Amino acid sequence: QVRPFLDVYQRSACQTRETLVSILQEHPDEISDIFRPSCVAVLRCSGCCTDESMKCTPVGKHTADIQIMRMNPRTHSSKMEVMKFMEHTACECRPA
Amino acid sequence: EVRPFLDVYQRSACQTRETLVSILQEHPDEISDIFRPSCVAVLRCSGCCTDESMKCTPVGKHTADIQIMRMNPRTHSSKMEVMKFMEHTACECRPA
């Protein structure tokens, strides 16, 4: 089936979409333990704008609370815990 | 509202997911015309393997026909046309 033009723009457009981020990357301050999973999916702005002169930019954000598993690499002890992650809420193509 | 673990895992796992690819990166030879949209969303493998020494890799590929607008900067015409893109059918965590 050919994916119709409107269905194409619907997904290509600048907007918030599921984006994988590394826990250790988002929290560089976390440098003693392992996390499972090691990455989480959160909304981030992405999509192609009218031209490369513009970039899909976040104009709003918030903090999501996500449950993950903290694994102590030294004792192999792991336990559920809630960690905060930054998430984009609104997007717009901007000059940048 | 905390995001429950099982849900966090379901999304973070290595699997095929919506991925933005520019028409130029998927069709490097298409350098003369302008496309609307200039990028498309297609299924590609990504995710964080439980085993950190593993990388999320495609184990099957297929194609998708997508309708796009081609704008000719010389003739100034712009019409619809079907363009094919590669997608990942399935993935697996493999050392790499």
For chain A, domains (ranges, CATH) are 2-96 (2.10.90.10)
| A to B CB pairs, distance under 8 Å | 87
Structure tokens at B74: 């010389």
Closest in A4, A20, A64 to B67, CB measured? A4
Q: For residue A80, what are the CA distances in angstroms to A44, A77, B44, B76? A: 25, 11, 30, 59
- Please give the single-letter amino acid code of residue B25: Q
What resolution (Å)? 2.0
Q: DSSP assignment of B11-76, as one string?
A: HHSSEEEEEEEEHHHH-TT--SSEEESSEEEEEEEE---SSTTEEEEEEEEEEEEEEEEEE-TTT-
Q: For residue B86, what are the CA distances in angstroms to A11, B67, B70? A: 16, 14, 19
Q: Which of A88, A87, A91, A90 is nearest to A56 (CA)?
A: A91
Mutate to test the interface with B, among A26, A66, A86 (most CBs of B within 10 A): A66
| Cβ-based contacts of A52 with chain B (< 8 Å) | 38
Residues 6+ apart with CB under 8 A from A82: A65, A66, A67, A68, B2
